[PDB]
Structures are given as C-alpha cells and as structure tokens.
Amino acid sequence: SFVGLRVVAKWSSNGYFYSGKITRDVGAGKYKLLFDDGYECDVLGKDILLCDPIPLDTEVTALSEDEYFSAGVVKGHRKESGELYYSIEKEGQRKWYKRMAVILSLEQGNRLREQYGLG
Amino acid sequence: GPGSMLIFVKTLTGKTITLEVEPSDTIENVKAKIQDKEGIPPDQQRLAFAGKSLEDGRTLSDYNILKDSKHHPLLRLR
C-alpha cells in the first residue's frame, strides 16, 4: 500500500512539491495527502514522488533563516527527536533544515519522477 | 507581467501558495491576488515578512524584500 508512506507532492500543474504523507488511496487516480505543515487535500498520483528521504545530491529549494527560499543541494540527513533534518548546501555553505523547509520546484521534482514517481 | 517575481505565502491553514508579483504591486494588490487564488478576503489578511508587518500602500520593494530571481520571499498571513 502507499497508505502511510512519506512523499513529496504537488497539488497544481506547475506547482512546488511539499513533503507529506499519503493517508488514503481514493477514487479517480488520486490520493489524500496530509502535508507536514497541516494542509490536507487530494492530489493526483502523477504529482507524487515516493522518495523519503530526498536522496543525496538532489537539487531542492529550501527556506533559509532569512525567510527566502532558494536552490540548494542535499548533502546529508539526520533523524533526531522523531524529526528529519536535511543538510543542504547553498553557495558553498551547508545548513540544517527541517524536512518541511525543503520543497521542490516543478523542474526539481520532475528530475526525480523517473526514479521515484508513484505508479 | 514579464518582470514579475515569485513569492510564497503561508496561510493560516498551513498551506503555502505561490504568487507572481510586480515590484510595483502594493500590499493591497498582493492581498487581492491571495483572494483571487485562495479565496481569503482581504479583510482577513494581515501579511508579514520576517516578522514585520507589511503596510497598505507600500510595495515589497519599499521593504527591500525583492532580490534577484534566485531568492523567493516567504510572506506569512497572521
């Protein structure tokens, strides 16, 4: 079952992918998704990436302390207090980001579809 | 239009949406875009960036928020 799996998923044709979990396989090619920041909605299967964690050297978009999203590369991960943190490099410098602060642009997520797309 | 810039907005429900904005867009225009996309009436919207309130009649540029096209600010509804 995909139910209970962690994923990264988008809910619009050109949108960003956000981390969450599948809570149900529902009708019409869709899955109910609970996103980590609390938003719940149905999403199309084509818009789900079953990668958890996002692998090393993936290009991602991450929210810095200064409240800007920008691109970086995954360099590591850590599990602590039941939470996952990613080490992401931007402009040669690594910082640690909560899972929910790491998202994928349309282009970045499309790069992972062949290996991690659902179905 | 062609010189528009991507921003993110986190709503009270925990959903983050994207918007394209102009440097000349006022905060009221941003609130209208949020209404148009997400259905939240402007009268419910209070926007902040990095913990500072964004006033009516200002643009994001009047707060030095917009950078290059490589860095996208997250605004937060409060």
Residue numbers in the entry:
A (entry chain A): 1485 to 1603
B (entry chain B): -3 to 74
What does the publication say?
In this study, we leverage this functional screening system to assess focused libraries targeting the protein-protein interface of i53, an engineered ubiquitin derivative, and its binding target, 53BP1. Using targeted saturation mutagenesis at the i53:53BP1 binding interface and a screening process in primary human HSPCs (a cell type with intact DNA repair, DNA damage sensing responses and other cell stress sensing signaling pathways), we identified i53 variants that introduce stabilizing interactions with 53BP1 and are more potent than i53 at increasing HDR editing outcomes in HSPCs. Using these classifications, we determined that the addition of i53 variants results in an increase of HDR by specifically reducing NHEJ events but not MMEJ nor other types of outcomes, consistent to their role as 53BP1 antagonists.
We first screened individual and combinatorial saturation mutagenesis libraries targeting two adjacent i53 residues L67 and H68, located at the binding interface of i53 and 53BP1, and identified amino acid variants that were enriched in the GFP+ population relative to i53, in particular variants that introduce a positive charge at residue 67. We observed that the L67R change enables a new 2.8 Å H-bond with D1550 of 53BP1, and that L67H forms a network of inter- and intramolecular H-bonds, including a water mediated H-bond to S1554 of 53BP1 and an H-bond to D64 on i53. The intermolecular H-bond to D64 could help lock the i53 loop conformation observed in the crystal structure and lower the entropic penalty for binding. All recombinant variants complexed with the 53BP1 Tudor domain and exhibited increased binding affinity relative to parental i53, suggesting a correlation between the improved affinity of the selected variants and their enrichment in the GFP+ population in our screening platform. Taking this data altogether, we chose four i53 protein variants that represent the sequence diversity observed among top performing hits (L67H, L67R, T12V.T14H.L67H, T12Y.T14E.L67R) to further characterize as protein-based HDR enhancers in HSPCs.
